[PDB]
Amino acid sequence: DMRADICVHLNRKVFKEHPAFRLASDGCLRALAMEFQTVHCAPGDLIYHAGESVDSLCFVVSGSLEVIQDDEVVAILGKGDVFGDVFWKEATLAQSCANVRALTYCDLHVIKRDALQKVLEFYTAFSHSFSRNLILTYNLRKRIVF
Structure with a gap:
């Protein structure tokens, strides 16, 4: 059974490209x-x-x-x-x-807040490296003042 490992491979343009994932274990x-x-x-x-x-x-x-x-x-x-x-x-x-x-x-490859937080709470080492490395390109919550 390699279903999961196919899914890891399908996400390679995120996982192997984004610096936030450099410390993620398999x-x-x-x-x-x-x-x-x-x-x-x-x-x-x-x-x-x-x-x-x-x-x-x-x-x-x-x-x-x-x-x-x-x-x-x-x-x-x-x-x-x-x-x-x-x-x-x-x-x-x-x-x-x-x-x-x-x-x-x-x-787009998207993950829900709930599902993401669950992984972060387990893999706490990755979670701090993730935090320090994931800089949003756009924060939909912040309002631009013209």
Whole structure:
């Protein structure tokens, strides 16, 4: 049975690319891979709408996305970017201040706050290296002041 190990391999563009995972043990990566989901967007698809609860950490492996608050483009995300919220440092979930819309076909690999926190609480060594290394590309909770 190699189901888990196939899932680790399917997440390689996150696990082997993002510095936050350099210290993840194989067992740790297996536990994470079981919880990650790959999302496929078409151009124009909304990944997150303003007002929506930010409950997942999203890694862009492919494509481009625009972030928009108040009908203003505030950022552009691309491969290797990560957006969502700091669930390891934040007590409570909050509403999104911005829309995230796909500009092209995109692959996102996403993990829910709950499933992520569970892994972090076990593998505490990785969890501090993860925290220090995961810098959000966009924090959907923070509001840009124009």
